[PDB]
Amino acid sequence: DLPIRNIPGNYGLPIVGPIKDRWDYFYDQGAEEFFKSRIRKYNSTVYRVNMPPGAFIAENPQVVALLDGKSFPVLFDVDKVEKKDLLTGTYMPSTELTGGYRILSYLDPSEPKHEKLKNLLFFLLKSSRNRIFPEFQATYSELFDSLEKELSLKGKADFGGSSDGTAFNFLARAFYGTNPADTKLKADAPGLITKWVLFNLHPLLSIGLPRVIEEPLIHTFSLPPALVKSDYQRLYEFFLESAGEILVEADKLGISREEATHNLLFATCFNTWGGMKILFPNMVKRIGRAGHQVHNRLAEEIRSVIKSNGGELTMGAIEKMELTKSVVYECLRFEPPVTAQYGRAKKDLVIESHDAAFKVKAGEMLYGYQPLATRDPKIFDRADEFVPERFVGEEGEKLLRHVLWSNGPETETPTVGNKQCAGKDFVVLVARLFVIEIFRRYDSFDIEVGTSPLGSSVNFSSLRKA
Ligand code: HEM
Numbered sequence: 001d002l003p004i005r006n007i008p009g010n011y012g013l014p015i016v017g018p019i020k021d022r023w024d025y026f027y028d029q030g031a032e033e034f035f036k037s038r039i040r041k042y043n044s045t046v047y048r049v050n051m052p053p054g055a056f057i058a059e060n061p062q063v064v065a066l067l068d069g070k071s072f073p074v075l076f077d078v079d080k081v082e083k084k085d086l087l088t089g090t091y092m093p094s095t096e097l098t099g100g101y102r103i104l105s106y107l108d109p110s111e112p113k114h115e116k117l118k119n120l121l122f123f124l125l126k127s128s129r130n131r132i133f134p135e136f137q138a139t140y141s142e143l144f145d146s147l148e149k150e151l152s153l154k155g156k157a158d159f160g161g162s163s164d165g166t167a168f169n170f171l172a173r174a175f176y177g178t179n180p181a182d183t184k185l186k187a188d189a190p191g192l193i194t195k196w197v198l199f200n201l202h203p204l205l206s207i208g209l210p211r212v213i214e215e216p217l218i219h220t221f222s223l224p225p226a227l228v229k230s231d232y233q234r235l236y237e238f239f240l241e242s243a244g245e246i247l248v249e250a251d252k253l254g255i256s257r258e259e260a261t262h263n264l265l266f267a268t269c270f271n272t273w274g275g276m277k278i279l280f281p282n283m284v285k286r287i288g289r290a291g292h293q294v295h296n297r298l299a300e301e302i303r304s305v306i307k308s309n310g311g312e313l314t315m316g317a318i319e320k321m322e323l324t325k326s327v328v329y330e331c332l333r334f335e336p337p338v339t340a341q342y343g344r345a346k347k348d349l350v351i352e353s354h355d356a357a358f359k360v361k362a363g364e365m366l367y368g369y370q371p372l373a374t375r376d377p378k379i380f381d382r383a384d385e386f387v388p389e390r391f392v393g394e395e396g397e398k399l400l401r402h403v404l405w406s407n408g409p410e411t412e413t414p415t416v417g418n419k420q421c422a423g424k425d426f427v428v429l430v431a432r433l434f435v436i437e438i439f440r441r442y443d444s445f446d447i448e449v450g451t452s453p454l455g456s457s458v459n460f461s462s463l464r465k466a
């Protein structure tokens with residue numbers, strides 16, 4: 001059996017310990033090296049550490065970090081961890097930001113409204129099933145038209161600053177059969193959502209600014225929700241007026257119209273649009289870096305399969321695209337869009353890692369940095385390499401149980417009883433559609449890459465048309 005080890009690490013002195021750890025995390029090391037340096041120092045993938053934000057935003061920055069793929073899955077086990085009010089970690093954004101409601105993502109499965117609200121989103125997704133393909137193809141075709149246009153003018157095309165409007169338009173049309181251009185939102189949604197997301201997540205982000213500016217402005221106190229209230233109201237009235245069909249189902253599930261609307265706003269703007277804002281530019285970055293031979297292989301597969309399908313792109317056609325499916329899973333393994341999962345121990349636990357077991361007490365906050373679980377070299381070969389074909393074939397597919405992007409194994413299903421992403425299948429689908437749209441149009445591409453507060457900044461510098 002595994003030896004019991006004391007959990008290494010410490011929290012330093014009051015006040016100054018957490019501050020120095022925050023400086024390492026944001027400025028002097030960055031998240032990955034913050035965690036890896038401590039793995040090396042402590043010779044352990046489980047250890048005590050302070051997490052941001054602390055200061056006057058979080059009451060208690062103290063966590064036990066789980067940084068390997070054996071220990072991490074404890075965070076999925078709803079019998080071992082409580083998942084209440086910890087979506088964003090050791091603080092929770094004011095409910096003033098969300099209409100006075102505790103939204104679904106913050107609810108533990110023991111709360112009755114968790115089941116109701118998750119069932120509502122499952123309905124939203126199922127009801128959209130026949131709109132996803134045509135609306136994705138229409139909106140993303142327009143995006144690539146715009147990018148070609150920009151490349152011709154500037155010699156480079158900024159992906160993110162057009163793709164955010166594309167994603168919102170796509171979601172409004174797919175989920176609600178509504179074109180935002182036909183509404184009072186016009187083209188304003190990305191700006192409105194970005195500001196509101198910043199008010200929620202600023203304690204966890206760096207914008208770029210020097211620490212002497214950022215620390216007092218975004219890392220010490222919460223930004224006042226009052227300042228984003230009017231912007232949120234514009235979004236709210238869009239959802240109230242556009243979500244008629246879904247609100248009928250909310251009524252049947254026994255959810256108030258107002259509670260339903262705030263929840264649809266959050267699922268659409270925060271979970272979906274926000275998640276896509278991180279994922280899509282990251283996919284362009286990693287696929288871009290994979291090189292032109294990989295691009296050509298994807299183009300050849302995708303185009304051949306669609307030709308075999310009489311030119312009609314369907315769910316069944318996608319199942320034939322082995323490399324495409326594998327590349328999407330490899331993006332999600334290599335660079336999980338949301339890196340931080342938390343859970344509070346409900347009872348005394350014994351957590352097993354690769355070489356030791358550790359005991360934690362009821363009430364301890366557990367934290368996982370997902371990239372260290374999904375790039376764990378004790379689980380994956382070539383763990384730090386992006387390998388496009390990793391998940392191709394029977395043996396490769398077995399490894400999907402260790403892909404964790406959805407807050408559960410990729411082989412498992414989200415349910416009302418767990419806290420796995422309600423949109424799991426939707427995300428994988430639209431990520432596949434995104435790769436398909438690129439390579440049906442282009443043989444290959446080149447990119448330029450920079451940092452962004454969320455995800456990556458990506459420019460196309462060449463788009464080689466078919
Ligand atoms: C690329 C896009 C997305 C990413 C990266 C993503 C990722 C995640 C992650 C990591 C969690 C776990 C949160 C936690 O720490 O507890 C989560 C939960 C959740 N996500 Fe997704 N998600 C995406 C898209 C979507 C979509 C399309 C939906 C539509 C329903 C959605 C709805 C939810 C909901 C409702 C939860 C909370 C589930 C519950 O309370 O049981 N997300 N997501």
Ligand SMILES: CCCCC[C@@H]1O[C@@H]1C/C=C\CCCCCCCC(=O)O
Binds near residue numbers: 339
């Ligand atoms: C703008 C929010 C994007 C993520 C939405 C996705 O639905 C899940 C929400 C899960 C956690 C919320 C906090 C996300 C912070 C993301 C940046 C830092 C990180 O990756 O840990």
Ligand SMILES: CCCCCCCC
Binds near residue numbers: 217218223227
């Ligand atoms: C980076 C914090 C700026 C806050 C914006 C307030 C808008 C009135």
